[PDB]
Curated annotation (Swiss-Prot), chain A:
HAMAP family according to UniProt: Ribosomal_eS1
PROSITE patterns noted in UniProt: RIBOSOMAL_S3AE
Species name: Pyrococcus abyssi (strain GE5 / Orsay)
Alphabetically ordered keywords of this record: Ribonucleoprotein, Ribosomal protein
This protein's name: Small ribosomal subunit protein eS1
UniProtKB/Swiss-Prot annotation, chain B:
Family: Belongs to the eukaryotic ribosomal protein eS28 family.
HAMAP family (UniProt xref): Ribosomal_eS28
Gene3D superfamilies with a match to the protein in the record: Nucleic acid-binding proteins
Designated name of the protein: Small ribosomal subunit protein eS28
Lineage: Archaea, Methanobacteriati, Methanobacteriota, Thermococci, Thermococcales
Keywords, sorted A to Z: Ribonucleoprotein, Ribosomal protein
UniProtKB/Swiss-Prot annotation, chain C:
Protein keywords: Ribonucleoprotein, Ribosomal protein
GO CC entries: ribonucleoprotein complex; ribosome
Subunit and partners: Part of the small ribosomal subunit.
Miscellaneous note of the record: Initially thought to be part of the large ribosomal subunit. Crystal structures show eS32/eL41 to be a small ribosomal subunit forming a bridge at the interface of the 2 subunits.
Family: Belongs to the eukaryotic ribosomal protein eS32 family.
Organism for this UniProt entry: Pyrococcus furiosus (strain ATCC 43587 / DSM 3638 / JCM 8422 / Vc1)
Name under which the protein is recorded: Small ribosomal subunit protein eS32
Disulfides per UniProt: none
UniProtKB/Swiss-Prot annotation, chain D:
Protein name, per record: Small ribosomal subunit protein uS11
Keyword Ribonucleoprotein (UniProt): yes
GO CC terms, sorted: ribonucleoprotein complex; ribosome
Functional summary from the UniProt entry: Located on the platform of the 30S subunit.
GO biological-process terms attached to the record: translation
Length: 188, 65, 36, 127
RNA sequence: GGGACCGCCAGUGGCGAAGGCGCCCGGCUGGAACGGGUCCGACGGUGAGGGCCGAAGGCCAGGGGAGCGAACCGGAUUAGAUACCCGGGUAGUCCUGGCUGUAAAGGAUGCGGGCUAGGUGUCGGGCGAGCUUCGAGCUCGCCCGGUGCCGUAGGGAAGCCGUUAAGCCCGCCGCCUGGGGAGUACGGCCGCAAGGCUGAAACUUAAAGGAAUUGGCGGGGGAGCACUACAAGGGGUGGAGCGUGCGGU
RNA sequence: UGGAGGUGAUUUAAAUGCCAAA
């Protein structure tokens, strides 16, 4: 009787969001197509575009619409692998974090977490200056760009490179990353 | 149902509550994982070149000092 | 009460904490009978 | 094409649970614990029970069309211990030996940023 | 949906009179170090009485209650188990306005001034020199103020302390006078209460107390050894009748 | 060479001291 219930399920194909290429990312079983809505799938950036450098970036896609046997997704959030950022924090260095709430040009609400690692121990005032620089750069980028462009730049590493170049003037750095992104709301 | 022969290639040391058990390294001679080297616990006198009959080949003894 | 840190040493006596508790219990009873 | 799933492994000092779901985690394929393969409560967290449970789960998953899995292994975490029990590695090895391919492996133990208070009082277990 | 808490970085590192203080941005505010051919002109030290601050717990009113958890209710362990272990659980722990004024509140070391070899880390400021991706960056040297370690003269019962003195000198206040009775009795002041501060006598006693030495012991650690130890084995004794020795009668 | 700190853990049950020294 149980295996009878398993035979009622059909498989649906999941596609990446539009601006990531819209490629196939997996399959999921369900008996009623309405139950597939709001499911979330996690994929690495290396799977989307093949390059063994960015294997520690993780993206979350959420199903929002089903047509036929296909399921289409939206961007929800991004995160770095825990084991990666755990290997950056060492003694005799300084970790600087900043969490910001932003609104993009086309009315998207985002929360962004960035991180910077300094070469040595530094004074707290220098930490405040670096955090202020990060805030200014992120606010300017959010005001300038649209949602998709902002997400692409954040995951590619352009924003981190600009932050590092600007923050070298306070203290030499070792790494600079956009640690996490989560979407909060979308335009009405 | 008949086990798999393995050949002893190295002696590690004595163990057990009363020093009754020896830990050895063996190489599988037959079966799915023929050629692999794993460590095992043996009861009774043993020397290099002996052949044991293992009833399964997936359990490995914890390393001793 | 006043401090006598010499009393806290445990050689040849019981614990000072419980002696203090016992004395405080004893002083309650005298006070109650005094009010009558 | 390729049907890939996820193996959630829960390992503590008292038991072990192996749970295979689909790629999105919302559909359960199979689920086996240490208490379903042994008779003695003392043997639930042993590596051998982990091997048996992993073999059963892998067979049930393979019969339904799963090819490979990504592994997520966790200890109880929270205010309890942060270290996985002895059955995690034996469970991981047994899945591959049963025929499933192995994707990426990571641990997802929940870690607090100074959360709540653990049991035992300010002196702990006194045994 | 809710209440509490801010992980790694984190450092004999920092700040504060002490109690104490760790997510980020903004406002208000106290103290200290360094640099100073700036100003006043002994205005200073200590401080009986007096005043203010003061962990946790507790009490009085009004809120809140996630997790943990005195009292309590059950399950076990045990000769018993009012406990240690396990499953639950009230007050409390949290916020607002008060009271209480107690800790191994310990650096078990009151505060101000002058003087008496060196060596070596680290935090803040200043000066000099050399590098540099030109960075509020890096390395080295010296001065002042903090914070550690090793050590000379001297000190001490010794452990040890030794320019951050427990050394030599100039000041002021507080306290002690063998062990118990006893921080008790009686009296007084303070507190809603719980309690706080002050504080004897009769009688009793030859030691109580400190630092270090040699052994013996530990349900402390490490190394070694033994068929009157074990592990792998062979044969038995303990049950019956009898030989012989012992207790008792 | 010798020291000072911090975090983890630490597998059932196991009470007593007579006789003598006198
Ligand atoms: Mg004294
Ligand atoms: Mg069970
Ligand atoms: Mg309890
Ligand atoms: Mg016990
Ligand atoms: Mg004064
Ligand atoms: Mg203290
Ligand atoms: Mg100094
Ligand atoms: Mg010295
Ligand atoms: Mg009175
Ligand atoms: Mg014997
Ligand atoms: Mg024997
Ligand atoms: Mg006989």
């Amino acid at each position: 009787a149980a295996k009878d219930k398993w035979k009622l399920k059909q498989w649906y194909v999941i596609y990446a969001p539009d601006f990531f290429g819209g490629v196939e990312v997996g399959l999921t079983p369900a008996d009623d197509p309405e139950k597939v809505l709001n499911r979330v799938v996690e994929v690495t950036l290396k799977d989307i575009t093949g390059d063994f450098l960015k294997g520690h970036v993780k993206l979350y896609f959420q199903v929002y619409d089903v047509k036929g046997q296909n399921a289409y997704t939206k961007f929800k959030g991004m995160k770095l692998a825990r084991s990666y950022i755990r290997s950056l924090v060492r003694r005799r260095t300084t970790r600087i974090d900043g969490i910001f709430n932003i609104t993009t040009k086309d009315g998207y609400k985002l929360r962004v977490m960035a991180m910077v690692i300094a070469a040595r121990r530094i004074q707290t005032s220098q930490e405040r200056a670096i955090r202020k620089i990060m805030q200014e750069i992120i606010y300017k980028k959010a005001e300038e760009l649209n949602f998709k462009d902002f997400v692409l730049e954040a995951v590619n590493g352009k924003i981190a490179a600009e932050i590092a170049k600007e923050a070298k003037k306070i203290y030499p750095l070792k790494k600079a990353e956009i640690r996490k992104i989560k979407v909060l709301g979308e335009p009405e | 149902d008949e086990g798999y022969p393995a050949e002893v290639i190295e002696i590690i040391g004595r163990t057990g509550t009363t020093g009754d058990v020896t830990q050895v390294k063996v190489r599988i001679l037959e079966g799915r994982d023929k050629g692999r080297v794993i460590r095992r616990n043996v009861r009774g006198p043993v020397r290099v070149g002996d052949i044991l009959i293992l009833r399964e080949t997936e359990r490995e003894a914890r390393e001793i000092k | 009460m006043k401090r006598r840190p010499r009393k806290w040493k445990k050689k040849g006596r019981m614990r000072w904490k419980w002696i203090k508790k016992r004395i405080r219990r004893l002083k309650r009873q005298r006070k109650k009978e005094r009010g009558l | 094409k390729e049907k890939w799933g996820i193996a959630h492994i829960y390992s503590s000092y008292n038991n072990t649970i192996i749970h295979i779901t689909d790629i999105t985690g919302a559909e359960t394929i199979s689920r086996w614990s240490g208490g379903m393969v042994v008779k003695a409560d003392r043997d639930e967290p042993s590596p051998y029970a982990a091997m048996l449970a992993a073999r059963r789960a892998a067979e049930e998953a393979l019969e339904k069309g799963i090819v490979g899995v990504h592994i997520r292994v966790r200890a109880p975490g929270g205010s309890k211990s942060k270290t996985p029990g002895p059955g995690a590695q034996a469970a991981i090895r047994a899945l591959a030996r049963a025929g499933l391919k192995i994707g990426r492996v990571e641990d997802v133990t929940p870690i607090p940023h100074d959360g709540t208070r653990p049991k035992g009082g300010r002196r702990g277990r006194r045994v």
